[PDB]
């Protein structure tokens, strides 16, 4: 399924080249521009654990998740991955724990040492 496919066929988008964050573009976005550091970004997402369980979805809340890009307001894999996206893009990201919640996890949804799968849609980005 999709997690296996991004694991086996994804693009390493880390600067270190450590395969910590792998990406597949699933729906091509608009033009060429990507957000810049500090932009307000609006996304929709779904997350799955490596045991198959769906741990979260913003769609189910009928509201996007909004944060300021490149500020550490999200796990590393999201700052890195969202920065690569065009407006209207949908991607899959596979996130090793060093770019996610590490050995601590996140109580209660995320165990220790968890590799995470996300589907992310970049709805919009705005300078403030
Ligand atoms: C504290 C008050 C609650 C506050 C909760 C909200 C605003 C509601 C908001 C929709 C979050 C979700 O609530 C439904 C829920 O989203 C997940 O399910 C999820 O999909 C996820 O992975 N996300 C969310 C989307 C952005 C990426 C990532 C994240 O980076 O999330 C961030 C995260 C957990 C960062 C930790 C913070 C501690 C550091 O030590 C650790 O460092 C490695 C990283 C979120 C946004 C936090 O900044 C803010 C909060 O936590 C988490 C699995 C658990 C999280 O609920 C807790």
UniProtKB/Swiss-Prot annotation:
PPIase FKBP-type domain ranges (all copies): 30-118
Molecular function terms from GO: FK506 binding; heat shock protein binding; peptidyl-prolyl cis-trans isomerase activity; protein-macromolecule adaptor activity
Main location: cytoplasm
Subcellular location(s) per record: Cytoplasm; Nucleus
Tissue specificity remark: Widely expressed, enriched in testis compared to other tissues.
GO process annotations (BP): chaperone-mediated protein folding; protein folding; response to alcohol; response to bacterium; response to cocaine
Purpose: Immunophilin protein with PPIase and co-chaperone activities. Component of unligated steroid receptors heterocomplexes through interaction with heat-shock protein 90 (HSP90). Plays a role in the intracellular trafficking of heterooligomeric forms of steroid hormone receptors maintaining the complex into the cytoplasm when unliganded. Acts as a regulator of Akt/AKT1 activity by promoting the interaction between Akt/AKT1 and PHLPP1, thereby enhancing dephosphorylation and subsequent activation of Akt/AKT1.
Protein name as catalogued: Peptidyl-prolyl cis-trans isomerase FKBP5
Organism (species): Homo sapiens (Human)
Covered range of the whole protein: 16 to 140 of 457
């Amino acid at each position: 399924g999709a997690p296996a496919t991004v694991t086996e066929q994804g693009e390493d988008i880390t600067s270190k080249k450590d395969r910590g964050v792998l990406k597949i573009v699933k729906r091509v976005g608009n033009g060429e521009e990507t957000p810049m550091i500090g932009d307000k970004v609006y996304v929709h997402y779904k997350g799955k654990l490596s045991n198959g369980k769906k741990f979260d979805s913003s769609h189910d809340r009928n509201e996007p998740f909004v944060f300021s890009l490149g500020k550490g307001q999200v796990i590393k894999a999201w700052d890195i991955g969202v920065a690569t996206m065009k407006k209207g893009e949908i991607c899959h990201l596979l996130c090793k724990p060093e770019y996610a919640y590490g050995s601590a996890g996140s109580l209660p949804k995320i165990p220790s040492n968890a590799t995470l799968f996300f589907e992310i849609e970049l709805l919009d980005f705005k300078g403030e």
